[PDB]
Design an enzyme around this catalytic site. Structure first.
Site, PDB file in Angstrom:
ATOM      1  N   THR A   1       1.233  -1.121  -0.160  1.00 26.14           N
ATOM      2  CA  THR A   1       0.012  -0.186  -0.111  1.00 26.14           C
ATOM      3  C   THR A   1       1.179   1.480   0.077  1.00 26.14           C
ATOM      4  OG1 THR A   1      -1.384  -1.186   1.470  1.00 26.14           O
ATOM      5  CG2 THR A   1      -2.238   1.070   1.178  1.00 26.14           C
TER       6      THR A   1
ATOM      7  N   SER B   1       2.744  -7.672   1.489  1.00 30.02           N
ATOM      8  CA  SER B   1       1.303  -7.258   2.018  1.00 30.02           C
ATOM      9  C   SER B   1      -0.274  -6.810   1.933  1.00 30.02           C
ATOM     10  CB  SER B   1       1.866  -5.764   2.732  1.00 30.02           C
ATOM     11  OG  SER B   1       1.270  -4.578   3.560  1.00 30.02           O
TER      12      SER B   1
ATOM     13  N   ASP C   1       3.867  -8.359  13.912  1.00 34.64           N
ATOM     14  CA  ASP C   1       3.420  -7.637  12.667  1.00 34.64           C
ATOM     15  C   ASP C   1       1.778  -7.222  13.547  1.00 34.64           C
ATOM     16  OD1 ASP C   1       1.999  -6.807  10.162  1.00 34.64           O
ATOM     17  OD2 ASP C   1       4.318  -7.962   9.554  1.00 34.64           O
TER      18      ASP C   1
ATOM     19  N   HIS D   1       6.823  -5.121   9.871  1.00 33.79           N
ATOM     20  CA  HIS D   1       6.165  -5.575   8.725  1.00 33.79           C
ATOM     21  C   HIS D   1       7.051  -5.185   7.983  1.00 33.79           C
ATOM     22  CE1 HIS D   1       2.781  -6.333   6.202  1.00 33.79           C
ATOM     23  NE2 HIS D   1       3.023  -5.314   6.435  1.00 33.79           N
TER      24      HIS D   1
END
Length: 207
Positions: free
Chosen positions: A13, A90, A175, A187
């Site tokens: 992201t 992710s 995480d 992360h």
């Protein structure tokens, strides 16, 4: 000419268009197999921020699942004997997870539970590497890491992926996204932490 091996990478992201943090393992495969080629998945990779076009995380995920399916299915039709590797970091892992394993993504409003890759394409996916996937749920055979809980889009208890044997998905306990920990730095580190293990796995599947 089709290559013998092709890699798809999906970024996290807000990362700039390209591979993002999937680049570590994508570049590892490319250097292990001269002549192989790679492409980045084109999708918003966004969580509501204007920098990435303003799409909400749910819209970004939905667009991303379709983008993965479109890209991989079309490539496989063009190059039916090319071995495929998927790498997603992710949110990039999440969109690949749904496309390959099905089951939908109910928190994000993705209601279709079918595997989105074609049957031909699934056969030619030889390895898939997910890092920091928010759908992580401890206790699936394809998972690696110290996380003993699960993330904010975790798979339900009892889930099975038909392509389990082709995947490694990594997540550690501290995480806050793929697990229920509280250290965001964890992360961001999976390329250096698990990169070599991931590449070993890919090598074992490709030959």
């Amino acid at each position: 000419s089709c290559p013998a091996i092709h890699v798809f990478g999906a970024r996290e992201t807000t990362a700039s268009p390209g591979y993002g943090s999937s680049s570590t393992v994508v570049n590892g495969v490319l250097s292990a197999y001269p002549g192989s080629t790679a492409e980045a998945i084109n999708y918003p990779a966004c969580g509501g921020q204007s920098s990435c076009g303003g799409a909400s995380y749910s819209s970004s995920v939905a667009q991303g699942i379709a983008a993965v399916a479109s890209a991989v299915n079309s490539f496989n039709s063009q190059c039916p004997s090319t071995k495929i590797v998927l790498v997603g970091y992710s949110q990039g892992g999440e969109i690949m997870d749904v496309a390959l394993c099905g089951g939908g993504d109910p928190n994000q409003g993705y209601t279709n539970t079918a595997v989105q890759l074609s049957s031909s394409a699934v056969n030619m996916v030889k390895a898939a590497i997910f890092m920091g996937d928010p759908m992580f749920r401890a206790g699936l055979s394809y998972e690696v890491g110290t996380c003993a809980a699960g993330g904010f889009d975790q798979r339900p208890a009892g889930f099975s992926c038909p392509s389990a044997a082709k995947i490694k998905s990594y997540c550690d306990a501290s995480d806050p996204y793929c697990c229920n920990g509280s250290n965001a730095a964890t992360h961001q580190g999976y390329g250096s932490e698990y990169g070599s293990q991931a590449l070993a796995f890919v090598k074992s599947k490709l030959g």
